[PDB]
């Protein structure tokens, strides 16, 4: 039978956690981390293994990497979590910064010495890990405190004495600055990336956010959540909440009339509050994505409108659609490149943008001279490289390059042009 | 005395590092085996400092932990580096000169009869950094080194102390302590070899095997072969990761409730596929190569004609020649042909078939985005690394692109070209061998640069022209049914008998035609030629 | 370079401060014994 | 007082019912004021019951940006000293930095403690607290950029980020910031949950000039 205090409770479902999306990360996490603590101690002792004692969560801002830590800390029938904000360790007096990072493990050692392998899980969560624990060896402050803190943590996570009843959770936005020695197995083994959701994730998040509103008969019967999940294309997890708040503010402002005149707040007006669909559409003009800032530019390039003055236009569009279909359906053809050429002023960029917009791919991006204007050569190379490196994440991707000739600064007098950018593009 | 009479080192956990153990034993405790009288008769002093260093996670702390119990030593005193420092003035220096009191007392009491006291400093580089760091502040980070140095150099004849210091970065250690009389011997611990890997795997799975918890199917030799660059810690992580899968078939976490099959609990057993999935999960942090070459030949071979076989045989002859003779310490080859014929694949195939200990590939993809100086440093470092192992193969891909050649100037980078020219002729250090294989597609341009005198031999790769080769690639690609494959070739025989295309374009056209009858594949094929 | 470096500063306590049980506040043990003696004698006197 | 059966407005309201945009004394900007007073000070006036049945929290950030000499600091001053709340904890631009190794982050930590204490002690009836950051773009710059050779440009930003939205919640504060250049502030400080409402204040229109003239004289 299970243990007397088996941490993860007998009956527990991912549905009651309260986090939408990320239905695979949770599996991986629980399989690798908590699968070995709900098992008869004799068997695990026979297998001769040890429980993992690390966990790292990294990703872009707003994806929900602090909600998970909170819920894990609160829902696991363990001791109270030991939360530490990022730069809360440092202290003035010499030799007190290091002591503050070894006063966190004292109770675990105290219990592990007495009750052996029957102690309860102790959990401590580091917030904003990468602030202090940088790669030791640089010249950061001129005193040398960060290196000592790093050394103390290194010596306490594995060290020469065994603890085997502790767990530490980390969170960060930049995983390339953490000192290498921390990431070795035995310290922060499982590392998980939390990224932006898909359409089903968006639907789940929308369902989670607007739960009490619905069940208290406070939402109209007109709103269709599927339509809303379809309209918000690149919204992350932390902006749907902003959308709900904005819609509620819009619905509330129709009664109080803040500024024009008070006293309109009366039982009749507030006894039938109901957020309609128009409120959400109005709210869509206040909250704007932060990653979906390049689809708008593509949308502004075909502002003049498409007119089918002939039939060749239809043919080329059909060819582009055929190629889109081919790249979508194939398996071994993982890269297809096209060229579009013709006399100046014939409308090439608009046609390409039109093919791009009708694809419906998750990821669409555009590089044009306007973006790179005012930069230095190295900045341009770095920008292009980063944009190309950002296209290897999603399963399907579309990238549009505008006016190749002007990207390399071609002028026929010399001829003069930049060789480095040309070589970069040719390689890429 | 100094080693327990009951000990053989077979029991202790550390495995895969045997030469290092013998070296340590010979250079550290050997002088303390005989009766003392001999040593003074021979005029040899005792060793005082030992230094261990290596990459993160190689087993040094394990050695430190088990040495005390294994070799009948006094309970070693273990102090973590940053624990020395303290708040009040003078406390730290006292703390350092408070560890040696027992040895001094015993020495004074019992002369040369005093036993051996050993103290080991974990994280040595934490406190004893360079003592010229500067900063204009509290000096407690300098008097610490001075105190230790005073008690280690001006010992006043304490000859019964051995300090062991374990670190991950030797460079950060203050240079004053790396000199005769202070940390003389330095032992490096590097990554294990394949046999040490097997030893580690055996040690890790001992208890698992003993209790009949491991299925007989599992084969440790295969696993040792697969783990190319895994250190010990990663092997342990792999073991427990594989065990997690077996654990997660009875206990279904999340899904449903806690359903524990009390009967399958007694039949718990690991198997091979679990280990393969575990290999999938865990990844090494060292890597180097043995993956880029494999992906470079992903499309595979087709043996569509005899030329492929002849070229491969010539490559085999050259690898044999460089393997056997001792007077031929350097061979360079050029592989040139029309664009798109397929060149990198052939070289990668030959290199993989060679099976030498060291293999690597340099391509513009890796170098992309760097500044010129970085590229130069990268190439130099890569060459220097290649000059290490007894046998080495190096492949250079698309030379013309590495030099940034554009025919409008003509513009190109002279520094890289000159470095490559000088490097391609440098014989390796004594008793080492190298085989360089470089591919190109602009033979004439190389002729113009006048670097054609550094290649011993050249190999051409003509593209296919007979429709028979097209039929072979078609049948190998399984494009169409047999009748269609016949019909297309009869039609193409009269549509355009003369043929010059390549290889890559053929596969591309085959796939595009598959996606969208003759009207597409043959149309494209005729259009290209 | 020139004027391209800033600096922080740390602080050590006093040696005379040393421990926390340094009499005049920690010798409240001995003094407490004096005070307990005082209390016992006063108890008798009040009785 | 006590809340009777009739759903009547909060006892200690923030804005009160005797308010109109002609009393502030800021002329010109008129739509901006509507936006600001709807997005921020609209969820603190409705009775707590309905706002609790919607499951929404209040906005805890405000950013004002624009050219030099337009009216940002005037708005901040008027908002601070014409409400019913605790006194603002004003901080100038580089007034946080200190000399010792760990005193700057502590200075950023000491601003929130009274709000933490009162929220812990009482709950949803705690009075609103205000703290205003002036010249936000002085210290809070993009992380990992050139400059701040000393390791202070990163610790400060991390502390503020961790203290404005962290593992321990807090919803009785309002932080307001003013700047001339919003292109240098960190990118994680401008997401919903930290400085949601951002407003640009531009040069006045002709009728705006008339309104300003009438206000001054
Ligand atoms: N599945 C979800 N993913 C993300 N956010 C969610 C989700 N469900 C609800 N939310 C809401 O979005 C917010 C996400 O921000 P959170 O507190 O997790 O910080 P974060 O994304 O880690 O941000 P940062 O990296 O800036 O610290 C939550 O406060 C919550 O209100
Ligand atoms: N088929 C079309 N029918 C009608 N209008 C079109 C069509 N294609 C493009 N346009 C419009 O005409 C203009 C096309 O010029 P655009 O600048 O996009 O192309 P371009 O020739 O690459 O440009 P440039 O003049 O900058 O070199 C745009 O305003 C677009 O909205
Ligand atoms: N003999 C062969 N049999 C079968 N497939 C081959 C053969 N040679 C090359 N290929 C395949 O043809 C494709 C093109 O080969 P590769 O990338 O080496 O071209 P290349 O001519 O060296 O390139 P480039 O024109 O860029 O210099 C690859 O998929 C490769 O596997
Ligand atoms: N809309 C306005 N109505 C009336 N007076 C105004 C207005 N805008 C600015 N002023 C006048 O301008 C003076 C200075 O303006 P303010 O304090 O807002 O500066 P600021 O915009 O913060 O400038 P800076 O960018 O230099 O900090 C105010 O004292 C006020 O007299
Ligand atoms: N022969 C071996 N080499 C390396 N690691 C081993 C060996 N045998 C066991 N291990 C395991 O690997 C880890 C040793 O790593 P350790 O030396 O503590 O890291 P570090 O080198 O940073 O001190 C332990 O978990 C140990 O059980």
Coordinates of C-alpha atoms in Angstrom, one line a residue, chain A:
Chain A
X1 CA 0.0 0.0 0.0
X2 CA 1.1 3.6 -0.4
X3 CA 3.0 5.5 2.4
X4 CA 1.4 7.2 5.4
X5 CA 2.1 10.7 4.0
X6 CA 2.4 10.0 0.2
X7 CA 2.9 13.5 -1.1
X8 CA 0.9 13.7 -4.3
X9 CA -2.4 12.6 -2.7
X10 CA -4.4 9.4 -3.7
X11 CA -6.8 11.0 -6.1
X12 CA -5.4 13.9 -8.1
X13 CA -6.0 15.1 -11.7
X14 CA -4.3 17.7 -13.9
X15 CA -7.8 19.2 -14.5
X16 CA -8.0 20.5 -10.9
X17 CA -4.6 22.2 -11.0
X18 CA -6.1 25.2 -12.9
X19 CA -3.5 25.7 -15.6
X20 CA -4.6 25.6 -19.3
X21 CA -2.4 24.2 -22.0
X22 CA 0.9 22.4 -21.2
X23 CA -0.6 19.0 -21.0
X24 CA 2.6 17.3 -22.0
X25 CA 5.0 19.2 -19.8
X26 CA 3.0 18.1 -16.8
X27 CA 3.4 14.5 -17.8
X28 CA 7.1 14.7 -18.2
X29 CA 7.5 16.6 -15.0
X30 CA 5.5 14.2 -12.8
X31 CA 7.0 11.1 -14.5
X32 CA 10.6 12.3 -13.9
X33 CA 10.2 14.0 -10.6
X34 CA 7.3 12.6 -8.4
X35 CA 7.0 9.1 -9.8
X36 CA 9.5 7.6 -7.3
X37 CA 8.1 9.1 -4.1
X38 CA 4.7 7.3 -4.2
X39 CA 6.2 3.8 -4.3
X40 CA 6.9 1.3 -1.5
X41 CA 10.2 2.2 0.1
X42 CA 11.5 -1.4 0.0
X43 CA 11.2 -1.7 -3.8
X44 CA 12.9 1.7 -4.5
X45 CA 15.6 0.7 -2.0
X46 CA 16.1 -2.6 -3.9
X47 CA 16.4 -0.7 -7.2
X48 CA 19.3 1.2 -5.6
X49 CA 18.5 4.7 -7.0
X50 CA 18.0 8.1 -5.5
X51 CA 15.3 10.8 -5.9
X52 CA 16.0 13.7 -8.2
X53 CA 16.4 17.0 -6.4
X54 CA 16.2 19.7 -9.1
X55 CA 13.8 21.4 -11.5
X56 CA 14.2 24.3 -13.9
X57 CA 11.5 26.2 -15.9
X58 CA 12.5 28.7 -18.6
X59 CA 10.8 30.6 -21.4
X60 CA 9.7 33.9 -22.7
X61 CA 7.8 36.4 -20.4
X62 CA 4.2 35.7 -19.6
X63 CA 3.9 32.0 -20.5
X64 CA 2.9 30.8 -17.0
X65 CA 6.1 29.7 -15.3
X66 CA 5.3 31.2 -11.9
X67 CA 1.8 29.8 -11.6
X68 CA 3.1 26.3 -11.8
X69 CA 5.6 26.8 -9.0
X70 CA 2.9 28.2 -6.7
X71 CA 0.5 25.4 -7.4
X72 CA 3.2 22.7 -7.0
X73 CA 4.1 24.3 -3.7
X74 CA 0.6 24.6 -2.4
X75 CA -1.0 21.3 -3.5
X76 CA 1.5 18.6 -2.5
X77 CA 0.9 18.0 1.2
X78 CA 4.4 19.0 2.1
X79 CA 6.0 21.5 4.5
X80 CA 5.5 25.2 3.8
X81 CA 7.6 26.4 0.8
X82 CA 10.7 28.5 1.4
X83 CA 10.2 31.3 -1.1
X84 CA 13.3 33.5 -1.9
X85 CA 13.2 36.5 -4.1
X86 CA 16.0 37.0 -6.6
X87 CA 18.6 39.2 -4.9
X88 CA 17.4 38.7 -1.4
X89 CA 20.6 36.9 -0.2
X90 CA 23.2 39.6 -0.5
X91 CA 24.2 41.3 2.7
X92 CA 26.7 43.9 3.9
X93 CA 28.9 42.2 6.4
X94 CA 31.6 40.0 5.0
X95 CA 30.8 36.3 5.3
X96 CA 27.1 36.9 5.8
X97 CA 25.9 36.4 2.2
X98 CA 27.3 32.8 2.2
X99 CA 25.6 32.1 5.5
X100 CA 22.2 33.2 4.3
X101 CA 22.4 30.5 1.6
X102 CA 23.2 27.7 4.0
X103 CA 20.6 28.7 6.6
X104 CA 17.9 27.4 4.2
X105 CA 19.0 23.7 4.3
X106 CA 19.4 23.4 8.1
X107 CA 16.0 22.0 8.9
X108 CA 16.2 19.3 6.1
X109 CA 19.5 18.1 7.6
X110 CA 18.0 18.3 11.1
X111 CA 15.1 16.0 10.1
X112 CA 17.1 13.7 7.9
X113 CA 19.4 12.8 10.7
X114 CA 16.6 11.7 13.1
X115 CA 13.8 10.1 11.2
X116 CA 15.9 8.7 8.3
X117 CA 13.9 7.9 5.2
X118 CA 10.5 8.8 6.7
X119 CA 10.9 12.6 6.6
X120 CA 8.4 14.8 4.7
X121 CA 9.4 16.6 1.6
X122 CA 11.0 20.0 2.0
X123 CA 10.7 22.5 -0.9
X124 CA 12.4 25.8 -1.5
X125 CA 11.8 27.9 -4.6
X126 CA 14.3 30.3 -6.0
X127 CA 12.8 33.2 -8.0
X128 CA 14.8 34.9 -10.8
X129 CA 17.7 32.5 -10.5
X130 CA 19.9 34.1 -13.1
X131 CA 20.4 37.3 -11.2
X132 CA 23.0 36.0 -8.8
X133 CA 24.2 32.6 -10.2
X134 CA 26.1 33.9 -13.2
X135 CA 29.1 32.1 -14.8
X136 CA 31.8 32.6 -12.2
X137 CA 35.0 34.1 -13.6
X138 CA 33.9 37.4 -14.9
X139 CA 34.5 40.8 -13.2
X140 CA 31.1 41.9 -12.1
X141 CA 31.2 43.9 -8.9
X142 CA 34.8 44.2 -7.7
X143 CA 34.3 42.5 -4.4
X144 CA 33.8 38.8 -5.3
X145 CA 30.5 37.9 -3.6
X146 CA 28.7 36.1 -6.5
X147 CA 31.4 33.5 -6.9
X148 CA 31.3 32.6 -3.2
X149 CA 27.5 32.3 -3.3
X150 CA 27.8 30.1 -6.3
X151 CA 30.4 27.9 -4.6
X152 CA 28.3 27.6 -1.5
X153 CA 25.3 26.4 -3.5
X154 CA 27.4 24.0 -5.5
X155 CA 28.9 22.5 -2.3
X156 CA 25.5 22.3 -0.7
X157 CA 23.4 20.8 -3.5
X158 CA 25.6 17.7 -3.8
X159 CA 28.5 18.1 -1.4
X160 CA 30.0 15.3 0.7
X161 CA 26.9 14.8 2.8
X162 CA 23.7 13.2 1.6
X163 CA 20.3 14.8 2.1
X164 CA 17.9 13.0 -0.2
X165 CA 14.7 14.7 1.1
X166 CA 14.9 18.1 -0.5
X167 CA 13.6 19.8 -3.7
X168 CA 14.4 23.1 -5.2
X169 CA 12.5 24.9 -8.0
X170 CA 13.9 27.5 -10.4
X171 CA 12.5 30.0 -12.8
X172 CA 14.2 32.3 -15.3
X173 CA 14.0 34.0 -18.7
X174 CA 17.6 33.5 -19.9
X175 CA 19.0 30.0 -19.5
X176 CA 22.4 30.8 -21.2
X177 CA 23.9 32.8 -18.2
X178 CA 23.5 30.1 -15.5
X179 CA 26.9 28.7 -14.5
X180 CA 27.5 25.4 -16.2
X181 CA 28.2 23.3 -13.1
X182 CA 24.7 23.8 -11.8
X183 CA 23.2 22.0 -14.9
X184 CA 25.1 18.7 -14.4
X185 CA 22.8 15.7 -13.5
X186 CA 22.5 15.6 -9.8
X187 CA 21.7 19.3 -9.7
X188 CA 18.8 20.7 -11.8
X189 CA 18.4 17.6 -13.9
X190 CA 15.0 18.2 -15.4
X191 CA 14.8 21.4 -17.5
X192 CA 11.5 22.4 -19.1
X193 CA 10.7 25.1 -21.6
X194 CA 7.4 26.8 -21.3
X195 CA 6.3 28.4 -24.6
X196 CA 3.3 30.2 -26.1
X197 CA 0.1 28.2 -26.6
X198 CA -1.7 26.9 -29.6
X199 CA -5.3 27.4 -30.5
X200 CA -6.5 24.5 -28.3
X201 CA -4.4 25.9 -25.5
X202 CA -6.0 29.3 -26.0
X203 CA -9.5 27.8 -25.8
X204 CA -8.5 26.0 -22.6
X205 CA -7.1 29.2 -21.1
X206 CA -10.2 31.2 -22.1
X207 CA -12.4 28.5 -20.5
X208 CA -10.4 28.6 -17.3
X209 CA -10.4 32.4 -17.0
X210 CA -14.1 33.0 -17.6
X211 CA -15.4 30.3 -15.2
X212 CA -16.9 32.2 -12.3
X213 CA -18.3 34.8 -14.6
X214 CA -20.3 32.1 -16.5
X215 CA -21.5 30.1 -13.5
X216 CA -22.9 33.2 -11.7
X217 CA -25.1 34.0 -14.8
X218 CA -23.0 37.1 -15.5
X219 CA -22.1 36.4 -19.1
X220 CA -24.4 36.9 -22.1
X221 CA -25.5 34.0 -24.3
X222 CA -24.1 35.7 -27.4
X223 CA -20.3 35.3 -26.8
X224 CA -18.8 32.3 -28.6
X225 CA -15.5 31.4 -27.0
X226 CA -14.3 29.4 -30.1
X227 CA -14.6 32.6 -32.2
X228 CA -12.6 34.5 -29.6
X229 CA -9.9 31.9 -29.4
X230 CA -9.7 32.1 -33.2
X231 CA -9.4 35.9 -33.3
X232 CA -6.6 36.2 -30.7
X233 CA -3.8 34.8 -32.9
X234 CA -0.5 35.4 -31.0
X235 CA -1.9 36.1 -27.6
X236 CA 0.2 34.6 -24.8
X237 CA -1.2 33.3 -21.5
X238 CA -1.0 36.6 -19.6
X239 CA -2.9 38.7 -22.1
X240 CA -6.2 36.8 -22.2
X241 CA -6.5 37.9 -18.6
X242 CA -6.0 41.5 -19.7
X243 CA -8.7 41.0 -22.3
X244 CA -11.2 39.8 -19.8
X245 CA -10.4 42.7 -17.5
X246 CA -10.8 45.2 -20.3
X247 CA -14.1 43.7 -21.3
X248 CA -15.3 43.9 -17.8
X249 CA -14.2 47.5 -17.5
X250 CA -16.1 48.3 -20.6
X251 CA -19.2 46.6 -19.3
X252 CA -18.9 48.4 -16.0
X253 CA -18.4 51.8 -17.4
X254 CA -21.9 51.9 -18.9
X255 CA -23.5 52.4 -15.5
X256 CA -21.2 54.3 -13.1
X257 CA -20.3 56.9 -15.8
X258 CA -17.1 57.9 -14.0
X259 CA -16.4 61.6 -14.5
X260 CA -19.6 62.8 -16.2
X261 CA -21.8 62.3 -13.1
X262 CA -22.1 59.9 -10.2
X263 CA -25.2 58.6 -8.4
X264 CA -26.3 56.6 -11.5
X265 CA -25.2 53.5 -9.6
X266 CA -28.5 52.0 -8.5
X267 CA -29.8 48.5 -7.9
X268 CA -31.6 48.3 -11.2
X269 CA -28.6 49.0 -13.3
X270 CA -26.3 46.7 -11.4
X271 CA -28.8 43.9 -10.9
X272 CA -28.6 42.8 -14.6
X273 CA -25.0 43.2 -15.5
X274 CA -24.0 41.0 -18.4
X275 CA -20.9 41.1 -20.6
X276 CA -22.0 41.0 -24.2
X277 CA -19.9 40.2 -27.3
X278 CA -19.5 43.8 -28.4
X279 CA -17.5 44.4 -25.2
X280 CA -14.9 41.9 -26.3
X281 CA -14.6 43.3 -29.8
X282 CA -14.2 46.8 -28.3
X283 CA -11.6 45.4 -25.8
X284 CA -9.6 43.9 -28.7
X285 CA -8.6 47.5 -29.5
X286 CA -6.8 48.1 -26.1
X287 CA -4.8 44.9 -25.6
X288 CA -2.3 44.2 -28.4
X289 CA 0.2 41.3 -28.8
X290 CA 3.9 41.8 -28.3
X291 CA 5.1 38.9 -30.5
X292 CA 2.5 39.4 -33.3
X293 CA 4.0 42.7 -34.4
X294 CA 5.0 41.5 -37.9
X295 CA 1.8 40.2 -39.2
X296 CA 0.3 43.7 -39.0
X297 CA 3.0 45.0 -41.3
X298 CA 2.2 42.2 -43.8
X299 CA -1.4 43.2 -43.5
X300 CA -0.5 46.9 -44.2
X301 CA 1.4 46.0 -47.4
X302 CA -1.8 44.9 -49.2
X303 CA -3.7 47.9 -48.1
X304 CA -4.3 49.0 -51.7
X305 CA -6.4 45.9 -52.3
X306 CA -6.2 43.1 -54.7
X307 CA -7.9 43.4 -58.1
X308 CA -8.0 40.6 -60.6
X309 CA -7.5 42.6 -63.8
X310 CA -6.5 39.5 -65.7
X311 CA -6.1 35.7 -65.3
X312 CA -2.4 35.4 -64.9
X313 CA -2.9 36.7 -61.4
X314 CA -5.2 33.8 -60.5
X315 CA -2.7 31.3 -62.0
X316 CA 0.2 32.6 -59.9
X317 CA -1.9 32.6 -56.8
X318 CA -2.9 29.1 -57.4
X319 CA 0.7 28.1 -57.9
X320 CA 1.6 29.7 -54.6
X321 CA -1.2 27.9 -52.9
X322 CA -0.1 24.6 -54.5
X323 CA 3.4 25.1 -53.1
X324 CA 2.0 25.9 -49.7
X325 CA 0.0 22.7 -49.8
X326 CA 3.1 20.7 -50.9
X327 CA 5.2 22.0 -48.0
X328 CA 2.3 21.3 -45.6
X329 CA 1.8 17.7 -46.8
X330 CA 5.3 16.5 -47.4
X331 CA 7.6 14.8 -44.9
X332 CA 11.1 14.7 -46.5
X333 CA 10.8 18.1 -48.2
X334 CA 11.6 20.3 -45.2
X335 CA 12.8 23.4 -47.1
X336 CA 11.3 25.0 -50.2
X337 CA 12.5 28.4 -51.6
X338 CA 11.0 30.5 -54.3
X339 CA 12.0 33.6 -56.3
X340 CA 9.6 36.3 -57.6
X341 CA 11.0 38.6 -60.2
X342 CA 9.8 41.2 -62.6
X343 CA 9.9 44.8 -63.7
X344 CA 9.8 47.4 -61.0
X345 CA 6.4 48.6 -60.0
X346 CA 4.5 45.4 -61.0
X347 CA 3.3 44.7 -57.4
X348 CA 5.4 41.8 -56.1
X349 CA 5.4 42.4 -52.4
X350 CA 1.7 42.7 -52.2
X351 CA 1.2 39.4 -54.1
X352 CA 3.7 37.6 -51.8
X353 CA 2.0 39.0 -48.7
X354 CA -1.4 37.8 -50.0
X355 CA -0.1 34.3 -50.5
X356 CA 1.4 34.4 -47.0
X357 CA -1.7 35.7 -45.3
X358 CA -4.0 33.0 -46.7
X359 CA -1.8 30.2 -45.5
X360 CA -2.9 30.1 -41.9
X361 CA 0.5 28.9 -40.7
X362 CA 1.3 29.3 -37.0
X363 CA 4.4 31.4 -37.7
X364 CA 4.8 34.1 -40.3
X365 CA 7.6 36.7 -40.4
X366 CA 8.9 39.4 -42.7
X367 CA 12.3 41.0 -43.2
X368 CA 12.3 44.3 -45.1
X369 CA 14.7 47.3 -45.4
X370 CA 12.5 49.4 -43.1
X371 CA 13.3 47.3 -40.1
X372 CA 17.1 47.4 -40.6
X373 CA 17.3 51.2 -41.3
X374 CA 19.7 53.0 -39.0
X375 CA 21.6 50.0 -37.7
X376 CA 25.3 49.1 -38.1
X377 CA 26.6 46.2 -40.2
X378 CA 27.1 43.9 -37.2
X379 CA 23.7 44.7 -35.8
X380 CA 22.1 43.9 -39.2
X381 CA 23.9 40.5 -39.3
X382 CA 22.9 39.7 -35.8
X383 CA 19.3 40.7 -36.4
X384 CA 19.1 38.5 -39.5
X385 CA 20.7 35.6 -37.7
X386 CA 18.3 35.9 -34.8
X387 CA 15.3 36.1 -37.1
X388 CA 16.4 33.0 -38.9
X389 CA 17.1 31.2 -35.7
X390 CA 13.6 32.1 -34.4
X391 CA 12.1 30.2 -37.4
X392 CA 13.1 26.7 -36.2
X393 CA 10.7 26.5 -33.3
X394 CA 7.1 25.9 -34.6
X395 CA 6.3 22.9 -36.8
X396 CA 5.4 25.1 -39.8
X397 CA 7.0 28.4 -40.7
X398 CA 6.9 31.1 -43.4
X399 CA 9.5 33.7 -44.0
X400 CA 9.4 36.6 -46.5
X401 CA 12.4 38.6 -47.6
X402 CA 11.7 41.9 -49.3
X403 CA 13.9 43.6 -51.9
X404 CA 17.0 41.5 -51.7
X405 CA 19.0 44.0 -53.8
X406 CA 18.4 46.9 -51.4
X407 CA 19.3 44.7 -48.4
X408 CA 22.9 44.6 -49.6
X409 CA 23.1 48.3 -50.6
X410 CA 23.6 47.9 -54.4
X411 CA 24.5 51.0 -56.3
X412 CA 25.7 50.6 -59.9
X413 CA 28.4 53.3 -59.7
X414 CA 31.1 51.3 -58.2
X415 CA 29.7 48.7 -58.3
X416 CA 29.5 49.0 -54.4
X417 CA 27.9 46.5 -52.1
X418 CA 28.4 44.7 -48.8
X419 CA 29.9 41.2 -49.2
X420 CA 29.3 40.0 -45.6
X421 CA 25.5 40.3 -45.7
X422 CA 25.4 38.6 -49.1
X423 CA 27.4 35.7 -47.9
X424 CA 25.3 35.5 -44.8
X425 CA 22.1 35.3 -46.8
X426 CA 23.6 32.8 -49.3
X427 CA 24.6 30.5 -46.5
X428 CA 21.3 30.9 -44.7

